[PDB]
Amino acid sequence: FTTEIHPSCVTRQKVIGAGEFGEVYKGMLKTEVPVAIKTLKAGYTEKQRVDFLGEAGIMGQFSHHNIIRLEGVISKYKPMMIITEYMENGALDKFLREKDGEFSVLQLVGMLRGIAAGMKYLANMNYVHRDLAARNILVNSNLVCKVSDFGLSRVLEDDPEATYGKIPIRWTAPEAISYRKFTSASDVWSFGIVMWEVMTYGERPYWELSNHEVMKAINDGFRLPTPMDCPSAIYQLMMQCWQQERARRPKFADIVSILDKLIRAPDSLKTLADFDPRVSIRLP
Ligand SMILES: COc1cc(Nc2c(C#N)cnc3cc(OCCCN4CCN(C)CC4)c(OC)cc23)c(Cl)cc1Cl
């Protein structure tokens, strides 16, 4: 399983993410290229070792532009490490919140197309992500968005947005919440939420509604309102991702096709969905 990298080829330089059992670092790989490096500290359990190397094992099965590339693993020395390509701009949700208003609509839609292409690949590889959200999309210096955060039980266990099953409620499809049915179609629901995150520059879905309030609203038929300056076709597409009936949602194949057609005829994105303002400002 995958390239075993000698520790002398890897230099950890700066902590960029942290947990109780290891950290994520920016570093360099001299087989000299930048890499992300995730560690697992000594004392780890069997389950931790299986979850940790399982993330790398899963990533090693994939070869797609919109899926994080695995460079290799350090497993025969401690601490163990996973080494991936480095995504200079980090997580998409923080990136958009820090860059509010700085992109064109075409750029934002292009990000969505990349995410959708990665998700179509995963779904057709029989991989259900379960935690698709802008926080799990990473962005590089070419503005390419790539799906990250792979594994089995570790995905939802490690995410603080996932609460008690243990689930990140406001990104998750109704059937996954209600009866634990996680499929590529529940990932499509999540993708609809990601579309809303991108078009709003990282607004938190459903604002301050509690988890129960969100579930009640969804079950009563309410959906997130249109973002400001959102192409009508983009809002229509996200709304179809939120059909209660799983079978009525687009597949990722449909999503990629639609986004590709909109990008290739970019004037189609100048028609905007009506934005319902929450504030009335009236001047004589
Ligand atoms: C290596 O192993 C793994 C690494 C990761 N995670 C990452 C991968 C991957 N993959 C790639 N690239 C990453 C880049 C990151 O931050 C870049 C610095 C952004 N700046 C931060 C400061 N602000 C103000 C400006 C932007 C990053 O940050 C936490 C995590 C990354 C995952 Cl999810 C799983 C495994 Cl197994």
- Smallest CA-to-CA distance from 154 within 78, 87, 56, 63 is with 56
- Can you give the length of the chain in residues? 284
Please list, in sequence order, all residues whose beta carbon lies within 8 angstroms of the beta carbon of residue 181, skipping any fewer than 6 positions away.
175
Residues at CB less than 6 angstroms from ligand 1: 16-17, 24, 36-38, 55, 68, 82, 84, 86-87, 89-90, 138, 148-149
Residue 85 Cα: closest atom of ligand 1 = 11
DSSP-based three-state secondary structure for 82: strand
Q: How far is it, in rounded angstroms, from Cα 136 to Cα 149?
A: 6
d(CA 138, CA 149): 10
Element (H or E) spanning 55, and its range?
helix 46-59
Atom index in ligand 1 nearest the CA of residue 136 equals 33
Cβ proximity of 235 and 273 under 8 Å: yes
213 is in an annotated binding site: no
CATH of region 1-87: 3.30.200.20
- Mutational test site, ligand 1, from 21, 50, 84, 155, max ligand atoms within 8 Å of CB: 84
Torsion of CA 18, 158, 200, 214, to 10 degrees: -140
- Measured between alpha carbons, how far is 152 from 154 in angstroms, rounded to an integer? 5
Return the CATH number of 88-284, one of 1.10.10.10, 1.10.510.10, 3.40.50.10440, 3.40.50.720.
1.10.510.10
* Residue ranges of domains in the chain: 1-87, 88-284
The alpha carbon of 240 is separated from its chain's Cα centroid by a whole number of angstroms, namely 19
Does the annotation mark 229 as catalytic?
no
- Annotated binding-site residue? 18: yes
- Give the experimental resolution in Å: 1.4
Catalytic residue among 51, 93, 131, 149: 131
Does the annotation list 109 as a binding residue? no
Instruction: State the DSSP H helix or E strand holding residue 25, giving kind and residue range, or none if neither.
Output: strand 23-29
Instruction: Give CA torsion, residues 248, 250, 254, 260, to 10 deg.
Output: 130
The structure tokens listed for 270 are 């100048």
Please indicate the experimental technique that yielded this structure.
X-ray
Cα of 90 from ligand 1 centre, angstroms: 5
Angle at which helix 184-199 crosses helix 232-241, to 10 degrees, equals 150
Residue nearest to atom 29 of ligand 1 (CA): 17
What is the spatial distance between Cα 32 and Cα 26, in angstroms, rounded to a whole number? 13
